[PDB]
Amino acid sequence: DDPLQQTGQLFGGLVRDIRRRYPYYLSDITDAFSPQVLAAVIFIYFAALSPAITFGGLLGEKTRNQMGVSELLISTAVQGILFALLGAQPLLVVGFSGPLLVFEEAFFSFCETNGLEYIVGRVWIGFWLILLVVLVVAFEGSFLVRFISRYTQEIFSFLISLIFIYETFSKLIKIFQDHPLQKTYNYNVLMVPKPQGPLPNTALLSLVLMAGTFFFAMMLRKFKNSSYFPGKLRRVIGDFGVPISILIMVLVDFFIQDTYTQKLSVPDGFKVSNSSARGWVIHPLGLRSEFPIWMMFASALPALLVFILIFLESQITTLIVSKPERKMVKGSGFHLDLLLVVGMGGVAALFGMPWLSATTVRSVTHANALTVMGKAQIQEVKEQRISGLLVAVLVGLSILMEPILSRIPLAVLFGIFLYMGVTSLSGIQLFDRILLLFKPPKYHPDVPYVKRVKTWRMHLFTGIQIICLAVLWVVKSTPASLALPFVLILTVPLRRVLLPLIFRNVELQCLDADDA
Amino acid sequence: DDPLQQTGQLFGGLVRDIRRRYPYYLSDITDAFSPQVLAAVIFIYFAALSPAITFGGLLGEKTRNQMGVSELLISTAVQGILFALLGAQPLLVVGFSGPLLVFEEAFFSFCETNGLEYIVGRVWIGFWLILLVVLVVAFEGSFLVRFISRYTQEIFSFLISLIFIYETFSKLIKIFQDHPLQKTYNYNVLMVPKPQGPLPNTALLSLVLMAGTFFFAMMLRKFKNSSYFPGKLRRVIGDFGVPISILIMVLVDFFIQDTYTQKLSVPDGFKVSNSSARGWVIHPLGLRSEFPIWMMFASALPALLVFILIFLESQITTLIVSKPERKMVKGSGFHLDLLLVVGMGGVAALFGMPWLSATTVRSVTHANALTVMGKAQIQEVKEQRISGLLVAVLVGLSILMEPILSRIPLAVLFGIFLYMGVTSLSGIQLFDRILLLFKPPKYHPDVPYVKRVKTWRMHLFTGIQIICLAVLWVVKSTPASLALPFVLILTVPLRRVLLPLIFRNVELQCLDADDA
Numbered sequence A, B: 001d002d003p004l005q006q007t008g009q010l011f012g013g014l015v016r017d018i019r020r021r022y023p024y025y026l027s028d029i030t031d032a033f034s035p036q037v038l039a040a041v042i043f044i045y046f047a048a049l050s051p052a053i054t055f056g057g058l059l060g061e062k063t064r065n066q067m068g069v070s071e072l073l074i075s076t077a078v079q080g081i082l083f084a085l086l087g088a089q090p091l092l093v094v095g096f097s098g099p100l101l102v103f104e105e106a107f108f109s110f111c112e113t114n115g116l117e118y119i120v121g122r123v124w125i126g127f128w129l130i131l132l133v134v135l136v137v138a139f140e141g142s143f144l145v146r147f148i149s150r151y152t153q154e155i156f157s158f159l160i161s162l163i164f165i166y167e168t169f170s171k172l173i174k175i176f177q178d179h180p181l182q183k184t185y186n187y188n189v190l191m192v193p194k195p196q197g198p199l200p201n202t203a204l205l206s207l208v209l210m211a212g213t214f215f216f217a218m219m220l221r222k223f224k225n226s227s228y229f230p231g232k233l234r235r236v237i238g239d240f241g242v243p244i245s246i247l248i249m250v251l252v253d254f255f256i257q258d259t260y261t262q263k264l265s266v267p268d269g270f271k272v273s274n275s276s277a278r279g280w281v282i283h284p285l286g287l288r289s290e291f292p293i294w295m296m297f298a299s300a301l302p303a304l305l306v307f308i309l310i311f312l313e314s315q316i317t318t319l320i321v322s323k324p325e326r327k328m329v330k331g332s333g334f335h336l337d338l339l340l341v342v343g344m345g346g347v348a349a350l351f352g353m354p355w356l357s358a359t360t361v362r363s364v365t366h367a368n369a370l371t372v373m374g375k376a377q378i379q380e381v382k383e384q385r386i387s388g389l390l391v392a393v394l395v396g397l398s399i400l401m402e403p404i405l406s407r408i409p410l411a412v413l414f415g416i417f418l419y420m421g422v423t424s425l426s427g428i429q430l431f432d433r434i435l436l437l438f439k440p441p442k443y444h445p446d447v448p449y450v451k452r453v454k455t456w457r458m459h460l461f462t463g464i465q466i467i468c469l470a471v472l473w474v475v476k477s478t479p480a481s482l483a484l485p486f487v488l489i490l491t492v493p494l495r496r497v498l499l500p501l502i503f504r505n506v507e508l509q510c511l512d513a514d515d516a
């Protein structure tokens, strides 16, 4: 009955994952039929787009425009549409992440030094990723996800949610750095590619738009589970909380004529960036020069790292999204979701388009957007394939809707990314126990991990996860940021060796409960 | 036992009000001995000062600097110190208001037209106010305050609290009007008396500082009756909520070097503004020219209006402050508080210094600052004379502490005035019933005015007060703003004639309850 279990046959998991979810494919399509879903499409679109614009820029400037915005938008769309209509957990938002950006930057520096064609080099990384995932799905290597306890999920879920907030602020800090509050400004300033000199009222209006969008979003979330207005209208106005928050603040910026703000820049059309270097289809043997033999066999060793990055990235997100406390009746297919994400990424490499992973904050936010509330607890979750599809489609059609996106500020969306960061710490027992460090022992939740276990022991456990978070934060900040998945895997030994010595088995049953 | 009752003897109320409160004068002084009180002194100081700076400016520019900041600061201090050590309800904050400003502007225009000495003219207004209050206190004319039902108190309390918020925003709107968000600015701009041309980052930083101070104050108020940190520390950090909110935001502005913000401007020393025209002591018969006879008898007719303005201003504030739902054990003396406020104002006129009234928002905020909370409901109220004294003293010594006040922005204090406006709508059944218009009939407080009385009837009553508010708002906006007290008195006939026809006696007992 459980999804994580080793079957005798080869490709046994993939078969059982299909026969589980595909009978509900009609019901899935019809689960989209509600206003929450439309509000979820509109919300998660900007959550899906803005990274594909941001990382698209970061790839472009870094990798001499071999991978850019045009490539990443098309990649995120095609892989998003395929995964929405096939993937066993459609709530998983397939997009490009920080850990993947770091690899492309690292692999480019490696290709640049040795004297190799980068875009061609990636094709052979992809060829191994097609072999390595099919090898794992054959023997059901996703059975290792069984041993990823709440411990590892909570640390990852919290680490990523904290980093996502630190990301959102550093963008705002960069505006104040580029556009400082000076006494005097250069009045005649070009903004052809971007403001050259500092501008007046740009950094503060950015701070205003961010603070405003975050406020409206958080106050309309409060309004949803309030007791004001009819229950029919209240939930509709609440579900369209972020859509209204963006609409208000985009119009606030629209009526401000003279003062400048940074807005969503998309490509002219659907052209590969730097057409002089590469086309659409990347020739494995080489575009210009003869790509050598030793790399075509030694493309496994980078692909092995890329696999671990995506595998730990995607499958831990699947546990967090398809958690028993979240009312997920349809199910979750770990073998099939791994096959598509990594498989399509390997095929995407052939077209010089970035491989993607199930992004945690985007996926959790997508589930949280489609989760209902009553009385408070979860009744069901609106689990469809159309929200996953429409988001991917709109990210594909993003360039054709440049005139609409051109009027939307970034400072507005930074308010929404702050919301996505705050909101993602909802059902995280770790974060809940960080709050209980500051609460005195009189005011506690009255739940097994505080009642069964002593306050001294509970804070010691909570204390180790802070030590564990602190290590993982240092690992990212240091040059070895691609090793963070291997340091996150090392949290499982900790739970299954070190803690059982220091702690009793009765307490870990409650502290690190498989289900709340 | 009740304070509002007509005794046989002359000056009967004044005697009974003294014999009530003065036995607790030792206990009053010792009721100051707590951290809430220090936090209340610091909070209400800026609430007391900034109007005496603002109206001080408005008097100065209007009345050719005959009344100014120097006059109003000294007047607010001396009358504040005397009232703190004598006044039967020390929580009443004696200061200058909008209605009094409008009269001084109107009386100056009258004096200017006819050809009379204004500052001399006020002395004879004051001479009548000394006679007219002592005549009222003799016959116990404060017995008319008995008939001011919750109806009239709630409308006034809400009208004044709404106007105080509209006041706070219009100041912020004036900054954006004077310092607009333009593409280009004049770089070389003098600020000798004040910024001549528009400045960059002034209006938005003002909006930031206001939004920030309001946020910190409202979040530290939430923290006070939260369940985080020790109960000993939590209430102390909470009680010093506004002091911390100002300290944070004043330091935020301090570390911003180059960009300009408007700060608390106080006089050079203790010198009367426009010394050429007037001295300290105003000669009744005239300073320069012969002040005529007809005015010395016809100074009653303006003084009669000034009396009604202060009498309705002060005594309705006394009902709101000394309300039965607020745990006021010490008592409240309506006859003695009327005598001091109007009497000292009449004596203050002799020194060319403005007469004052018990200001509603400042008084309510002062009581709310000294009110404790448990579990939520009120246990007791820290009712002392030292908070009233220290505020008055600090407003007196404000000019000697110019270097401290010079670094404090106005935009910061606008955040605190927004807090004072929001916070003042706490125990107002009217405002509570405005919220119940938007709530559906399932989610209601379960209290006599919603349970005994039907929702149709309850919203009709709530509806009349909105019609009543709308009239009182139009009355202020129109030139006849000094008639608003007489239109507020007209709400008592409404309750005792019109409503008893349209409504049943059983419903008014609950809707318009003397006590909750």
Ligand SMILES: CCCCCCCCCCCCCCCCCC(=O)OC[C@H](COP(=O)([O-])OCC[N+](C)(C)C)OC(=O)CCCCCCCCCCCCCCCCC
Pocket: A208, A211, A212, A215, A252, A255, A256, A257, A258, B172, B173, B176, B177, B179, B180, B181, B182, B210, B211, B214, B215, B218, B418
């Ligand atoms: C419980 C939590 C508490 C914390 C809550 C904090 C929430 C954060 C909210 C942030 C504010 C969002 C609104 C931004 C508005 C910016 C307006 C602007 O820059 O336009 C200038 C506008 C833009 O129009 P313009 O540039 O065409 O101006 C042309 C003017 N002439 C021709 C004269 C040059 O310029 C003006 O100054 C026009 C004159 C009118 C003045 C307009 C200013 C309005 C400001 C009101 C703010 C109201 C909200 C404040 C709430 C804060 C406290 C809760």
Ligand SMILES: CCCCCCCCCCCCCCCCCC(=O)OC[C@H](COP(=O)([O-])OCC[N+](C)(C)C)OC(=O)CCCCCCCCCCCCCCCCC
Pocket: A172, A173, A176, A177, A180, A181, A182, A207, A210, A211, A212, A214, A215, B208, B211, B212, B215, B252, B255, B256, B257, B258
């Ligand atoms: C509920 C949601 C709504 C709540 C709203 C509450 C209000 C929030 C804002 C309050 C804080 C205001 C800080 C003003 C910063 C002014 C800029 C400054 O320091 O000068 C730049 C200074 C200029 O001053 P300078 O001259 O001393 O600096 C040196 C200048 N250079 C570099 C050229 C040599 O420039 C910098 O050096 C950049 C440093 C980065 C500082 C940026 C701080 C950003 C503030 C973020 C606050 C978080 C709030 C986010 C909103 C959501 C709520 C969490």
Ligand SMILES: *[C@@H]1O[C@H](CO)[C@@H](O[C@@H]2O[C@H](CO)[C@@H](O)[C@H](O)[C@H]2NC(C)=O)[C@H](O)[C@H]1NC(C)=O
Pocket: A060, A063, A064, A065, A066, A274, A276, A277
């Ligand atoms: C676009 O691609 C071209 C072609 O590779 C890049 O040009 C190379 O990179 C830099 C020039 O910027 C030189 O060091 C190399 O010698 C160039 N080689 C070739 C084959 O031209 C260029 O960097 C890319 N431009 C961007 C940033 O889009």
Ligand SMILES: *[C@@H]1O[C@H](CO)[C@@H](O[C@@H]2O[C@H](CO)[C@@H](O)[C@H](O)[C@H]2NC(C)=O)[C@H](O)[C@H]1NC(C)=O
Pocket: B064, B065, B273, B274, B275, B276, B277
């Ligand atoms: C001080 O007060 C005097 C008295 O009004 C002001 O001097 C007058 O200015 C008005 C215009 O506002 C003229 O109509 C009068 O003729 C002036 N009277 C005189 C000569 O005193 C003065 O403007 C005020 N300002 C100062 C100097 O402090």
Ligand SMILES: CC(C)CCC[C@@H](C)[C@H]1CC[C@H]2[C@@H]3CC=C4C[C@@H](O)CC[C@]4(C)[C@H]3CC[C@]12C
Pocket: A035, A042, A236, A240, A243, A244, A246, A247, A250, A251, A408
């Ligand atoms: C482009 C950016 C700035 C904002 C875009 C958000 C737009 C598309 C959102 C914001 C509010 C939304 C509306 C909110 C409520 C409803 C009622 C529902 O019964 C039908 C959809 C409808 C009518 C929504 C349509 C989409 C909507 C207009």
Ligand SMILES: CC(C)CCC[C@@H](C)[C@H]1CC[C@H]2[C@@H]3CC=C4C[C@@H](O)CC[C@]4(C)[C@H]3CC[C@]12C
Pocket: A010, A011, A014, A015, A130, A134, A339, A343, A344
């Ligand atoms: C996306 C691409 C690159 C993936 C390629 C992997 C191939 C080898 C996979 C994908 C789907 C798989 C099939 C899915 C289902 C079944 C039914 C089962 O009873 C026997 C195996 C069989 C027939 C699988 C064989 C292997 C298979 C064909």
Ligand SMILES: CC(C)CCC[C@@H](C)[C@H]1CC[C@H]2[C@@H]3CC=C4C[C@@H](O)CC[C@]4(C)[C@H]3CC[C@]12C
Pocket: A074, A077, A078, A270, A392, A393, A396, A397
């Ligand atoms: C339309 C919905 C369903 C899918 C969203 C993505 C669409 C718009 C994207 C994905 C890949 C894109 C194609 C990629 C490459 C090219 C070659 C170029 O020389 C012309 C445009 C063309 C032919 C693009 C057309 C639009 C396209 C099909």
Ligand SMILES: CC(C)CCC[C@@H](C)[C@H]1CC[C@H]2[C@@H]3CC=C4C[C@@H](O)CC[C@]4(C)[C@H]3CC[C@]12C
Pocket: A455, A456, A459, A460, A463, A464, A466, A467, A470
């Ligand atoms: C991040 C680095 C610098 C610090 C490591 C995390 C800190 C915050 C952790 C590590 C050990 C923890 C302590 C371990 C045990 C106890 C006893 C308990 O009865 C109260 C909490 C208290 C006192 C914990 C507070 C938080 C703590 C101090």
Ligand SMILES: CC(C)CCC[C@@H](C)[C@H]1CC[C@H]2[C@@H]3CC=C4C[C@@H](O)CC[C@]4(C)[C@H]3CC[C@]12C
Pocket: B035, B042, B236, B240, B243, B244, B246, B247, B250
């Ligand atoms: C800061 C400017 C704007 C106004 C002046 C406010 C000053 C005097 C306020 C702000 C914060 C206050 C402190 C806050 C908390 C405490 C703890 C309490 O157990 C003793 C008093 C003490 C130590 C306060 C002393 C006075 C204080 C320092």
Ligand SMILES: CC(C)CCC[C@@H](C)[C@H]1CC[C@H]2[C@@H]3CC=C4C[C@@H](O)CC[C@]4(C)[C@H]3CC[C@]12C
Pocket: B074, B077, B078, B081, B270, B393, B396, B397
């Ligand atoms: C701390 C409490 C008791 C007092 C607060 C207010 C004090 C400081 C103020 C109120 C009125 C003030 C006086 C008003 C008028 C004058 C005349 C002037 O030519 C010299 C200063 C002098 C003599 C002032 C001295 C200080 C004073 C007495």
Ligand SMILES: CC(C)CCC[C@@H](C)[C@H]1CC[C@H]2[C@@H]3CC=C4C[C@@H](O)CC[C@]4(C)[C@H]3CC[C@]12C
Pocket: B437, B455, B456, B457, B459, B460, B462, B463, B464, B466, B467, B470
């Ligand atoms: C804004 C100023 C100028 C006047 C407007 C007053 C409005 C808000 C008042 C006046 C009378 C009121 C109505 C009186 C009675 C009822 C019946 C009740 O079952 C539903 C609410 C309803 C329908 C009220 C809604 C609010 C109402 C319409």
